Amino acid sequence: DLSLTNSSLMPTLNPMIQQLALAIAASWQSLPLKPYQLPEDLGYVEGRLEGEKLVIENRCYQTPQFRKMHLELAKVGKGLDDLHCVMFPEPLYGLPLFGCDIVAGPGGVSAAIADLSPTQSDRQLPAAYQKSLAELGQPEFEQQRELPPWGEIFSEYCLFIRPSNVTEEERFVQRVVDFLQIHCHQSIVAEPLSEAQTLEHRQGQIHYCQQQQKNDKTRRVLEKAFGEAWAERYMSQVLFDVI
Ligand SMILES: C=CC1=C(C)/C(=C/c2[nH]c(Cc3[nH]c(/C=C4\NC(=O)C(C)=C4C=C)c(C)c3CCC(=O)O)c(CCC(=O)O)c2C)NC1=O
């Protein structure tokens, strides 16, 4: 399932989304993957109420270091495209949370967000991450976006932009590839932590999922195609499940 060649959505998504989906899949392809079963063994889902149809493709995996690796592609009607990805770490290893959300319409990408988010109580990334991320240097983008109020969960390296041209699209993709290369290497060298530290990282992941559920822009997309009760179950059990 991890080849995207069987995807029905891929050919119709915004090109930046296609490039990022491919890069994520390439990063995961040779890991010690096992399937992760979403609620009701959800793969493909389509729904419509009174407006536009929402189509969603889900792929989910797990490894010893990552309890849940979720790649979701979505399209609303013919306008709105979305790529959503979260690698949820196993708290035992103390790794940060990789996440990204890319939203596009007919006139281009409106929102591109990626981060390696902290799970420590002091809201800092592990020292090895800080060092590696600082060495990449700060990227220059013309149109930055300020994080909403629930976005206190994001690191100081969080990127949130509207890409202004294809060069910036490519620059953002390359920065996400760099984040993934750092993250995959740190996962090899990570050691199992003490019970007390595992608990702190668990709490940090819970908090991340609770704050992400406050994103009303995501919720309203789901609500308009499936209704309020479906949307709440999807947000809380599929996208941002509390462990
Ligand atoms: C069904 C799945 C799914 C859909 C439909 C979705 C849609 C979605 N996500 C966002 C913004 C959107 N997404 C995020 C961030 C994230 N969101 C995440 O799922 C993750 C992992 C991050 C961060 C790593 C932020 C911070 C914002 C801006 C929220 C705002 O402007 O209020 C928008 C508003 C775009 C804009 O303002 O230009 C939409 C429609 N996101 C999804 O995940």
Numbering used by the authors: 5 to 247
Paste lines from the article.
PcyA catalyzes a two-step reduction reaction: in the first step, the D-ring vinyl group of BV is reduced using two electrons and two protons to produce the reaction intermediate, 181, 182-dihydrobiliverdin (18EtBV), and in the second step, the A-ring of 18EtBV is reduced using two electrons and two protons to synthesize PCB. In the case of PcyA, three residues, namely, glutamate, histidine, and aspartate (Glu76, His88, and Asp105 in Synechocystis PcyA), present near the D- and A-rings of BV, are essential for the PcyA reaction. Here, we performed neutron crystallography and quantum chemical analysis of the D105N–BV and I86D–BV complexes to determine the protonation states of BV and the surrounding residues and study the correlation between the absorption spectra and protonation states around BV.
We recently found that Ile86, located near Glu76 and Asp105 in the three-dimensional (3D) structure, is important for the PcyA catalytic reaction. Glu76 and His88 showed different hydrogen bonding with surrounding residues compared with WT PcyA, further explaining why D105N and I86D have much lower activities for phycocyanobilin synthesis than the WT PcyA.
